[PDB]
Symmetry: C3
Subunit: 112 residues, 3 copies
């Protein structure tokens, strides 16, 4: 059916994990400065993203199929999984915001 | 294992998106009346559903695999995605009810 | 990329349904005692799990792909589907805890 639709500048929406992960990635290496040698690396492979941060070791952060959707493996706080509530990425365990979690674990490695 | 189960009138539960989309579809063309020419068409293809409504143009509404589940493309309010909270379909962005959203956008096209 | 990761005792996280279903399963046959003949069987096939409980008949409990994730077929309360909120398995219909639901339906069959 309708031609009223496909004559528009259509596009494909984009995964919301994908999105977070960019404003993460760039928000991140763009702190790979204020890294006084101590956050050496951000790497965003292919919906897999790594922090070297020898202070605690290395974080991995994946996209993942549901039962629920972004996966956190923090070498300090350990493992967690996230889905959207009100447009925030939040913890399936107890509903903390992953932003916050990194935001801490990350500020602790400058601070220290 | 058990024969105590498959001797019952068994069935397969049905997608909850599927359900909404019917009591939507029929709730909808059944307003394709009170359409004073101005909501011309509802079309429910194959888990894809279209509103022609030339007042703003044409809405699409899909079933979608998670990262989250019913997709709204409103030619007026733009794009949104929905999952169940308390048995309501609600917005992943901010948790509004999609019922409400259509309910407005739709009443605006008679009103106008 | 990094070797700082795969030299750790890595593992694969485990489905959260899977988990519930074990501390369920064992929590369950381990009540297949206090079963005064009246909860005869728990069977955990392959992410499919059955209660014979002739008092109401037989419960099935599945893992299921999302639109949402653990499926309850109670021969008494009928059918329900569950996902995590704050690390609890909760009802998509109205957000009751499935623990509670079984916890009742199950205590009713001793009680009676």
């Amino acid at each position: 059916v309708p031609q009223e639709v496909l004559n528009l500048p259509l596009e494909k929406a984009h995964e919301e994990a994908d999105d977070y992960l960019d404003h993460l990635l760039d928000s991140l290496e763009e702190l790979s400065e204020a890294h006084p040698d101590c956050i050496p690396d951000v790497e965003l492979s292919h919906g897999v993203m790594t922090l070297e941060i020898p202070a605690f070791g290395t974080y991995v952060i994946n996209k993942q199929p549901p039962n629920k959707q972004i996966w956190l493996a923090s070498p300090l706080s350990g493992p967690n999984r996230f889905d959207l509530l009100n447009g925030e990425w939040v913890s399936l365990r107890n509903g903390t915001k992953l932003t916050d979690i990194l935001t801490e674990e990350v500020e602790k490695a400058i601070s220290k």
